[PDB]
Point group: C3
Chain length 183, copies 3
């Protein structure tokens, strides 16, 4: 089936939506449709937007960009936890470990991954290069994986959440699944 993805760029004031549209087009080999939103960094508007995308637009996956640091105005993770049914602690932890391979200041991000209804919501960085580094991971000179991107586990997570069967281009990111889940 078609994967319905919501893309939310949270601007304190856009490069965020465009970076996601480009990366997802290169990575996915199964069909997808986008619902894109560019909004201010105000917590109640981020919460409303996430509920709109999950509840009224029926998105299977929502990726946010921006507003995850320590500063007073950065409230994207707070809005995401407010609308969640359940937290996925491994996603925050591992997005920080992937990002620490690039710079030590990755530990200042408060990004989370949560589930609302059957949708997965992931908070990504505001800079385009960081968005791609997080999703795809760290490879060597010959292209071999050193540390898997966070997207390597997203297709199987959507499958466990009773969503569509998603596949990726192995040259960009390989979609890991156990024998029990492979078609």
């Amino acid at each position: 089936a078609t994967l319905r993805i919501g893309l939310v760029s949270i601007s304190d004031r856009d490069k965020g939506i465009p970076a996601l549209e480009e990366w997802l087009t290169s990575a996915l080999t199964t069909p997808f449709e986008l619902e894109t939103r560019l909004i201010p960094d105000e917590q109640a508007i981020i919460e409303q937007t996430l509920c709109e995308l999950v509840d009224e637009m029926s998105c299977h996956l929502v990726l946010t960009t921006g507003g995850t640091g320590p500063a007073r105005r950065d409230v994207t993770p707070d809005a995401t936890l407010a609308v969640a049914d359940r937290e996925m602690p491994g996603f925050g932890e591992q997005m920080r470990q992937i990002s620490l391979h690039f710079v030590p200041t990755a530990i200042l991000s408060r990004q989370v991954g949560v589930i609302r209804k059957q949708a997965l919501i992931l908070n990504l960085p505001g800079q385009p290069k960081s968005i791609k580094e997080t999703l795809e991971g760290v490879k060597d000179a010959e292209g071999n994986v050193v540390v898997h991107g966070i997207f390597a586990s997203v297709p199987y997570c959507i499958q466990l959440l009773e969503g569509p069967y998603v596949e990726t281009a192995p040259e960009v990111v390989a979609a890991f699944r156990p024998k029990s889940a492979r078609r």
Copy 2:
């Protein structure tokens, strides 16, 4: 003294209890006694079982297997946090980092380690191979430790919780303790 260990296999429907009984028999060199329970994946029955083992059976350690993923029915970590007095964030984090050496999808687990009364409760995976990988860690071809298993810190944690003095077979897992705690 004898270490009293509770083993809980949480079945959505058993290989879980048997994998733990085998590993603990190979790893521990001090005496232990087991209290084993096989139960359905229903949150209130998991909570009741954990309270039974800690409060009425006086277990010093409880190890659970199964029901820690993202799917709607997996509620083992929710039950474990509900009965906890305190969380041990390092145990969830490091069980995920150990498991990431094997597969990238380890970040989909929501496993926790908590304390109830003076007992330590740890959530482990449902598959037998994963149970052993988590407890014992990653070694090289000659058998040298690369990343310590989660059990390397359990004997000292039980000692700090005023429990019995536990020792392990160094060929399986070495029990780390500071000078202040060594007998």
Copy 3:
């Protein structure tokens, strides 16, 4: 400007204050002033002390030492979360990953990093060697960084919190900042 730092040694009963005074003197090249407190391990007195330092003494940074393990009396992280406006999950996670390079029992620490008002509060270990290992990280024989210390991100975090411009001696720890924040 002058950085105002609070140092809190939480004694269950001192080497903690002195280890911090020595390390900060070697690491910082911009001016700082210290507010030092030696207190018992009782949760309400730790909470009061942290509020005193942030609210009445206007500290930009507070570093605590001691009382972060699993034992019943170790309540430094509980007091720190009680007085927080917001948690910084990356600081707890990465202090544990840095400390795991030395010993596997680092996962028994429940240390956190939080923000109260515009101040950053970090929980460090009770042993002097561990305090320095956490702040400065892991280097090789020639002095090159393997894993950055937790202090490499503190100057930029204080800047994002609208505090003074802090600089460090690169021979001890290099202060990472993006192009947007460098003067």
